[PDB]
Curated annotation (Swiss-Prot):
Location of this chain's protein in the cell: Nucleus
Boundaries of the shown chain within the full protein: 1 to 56 of 503
U-box domain mapped to chain residues: 1-56
Name listed for the protein in its UniProt record: Pre-mRNA-processing factor 19
Annotated function: Probable ubiquitin-protein ligase involved in pre-mRNA splicing. Acts as a central component of the NTC complex (or PRP19-associated complex) that associates to the spliceosome to mediate conformational rearrangement or to stabilize the structure of the spliceosome after U4 snRNA dissociation, which leads to spliceosome maturation. It is also probably involved in DNA repair.
Subunit-level organization: Homotetramer. Component of the NTC complex (or PRP19-associated complex), composed of at least CEF1, CLF1, ISY1, NTC20, SNT309, SYF1, SYF2, and PRP19.
Family of the protein in this entry: Belongs to the WD repeat PRP19 family.
Note: Present with 11700 molecules/cell in log phase SD medium. The tetramer is an elongated particle consisting of four globular WD40 domains held together by a central stalk.
Length: 56
């Protein structure tokens, strides 16, 4: 329930199908323009496969 990039309480809670944690969209955007990797599995590219946790 805390981000795998930096552990911040998210403003845009976001998941990637490989890592399966919940990170902040903004902190993933940093990591995924750095290397593209998922923060845990290091699978190249993340945001092109993003699951944003909408309030709906």
């Amino acid at each position: 329930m805390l981000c795998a990039i930096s552990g911040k309480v998210p403003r845009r809670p976001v998941l990637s199908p490989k890592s399966r944690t919940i990170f902040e969209k903004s902190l993933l955007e940093q990591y995924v323009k750095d290397t593209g990797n998922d923060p845990i599995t290091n699978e190249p590219l993340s945001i092109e496969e993003i699951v944003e946790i909408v309030p709906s």
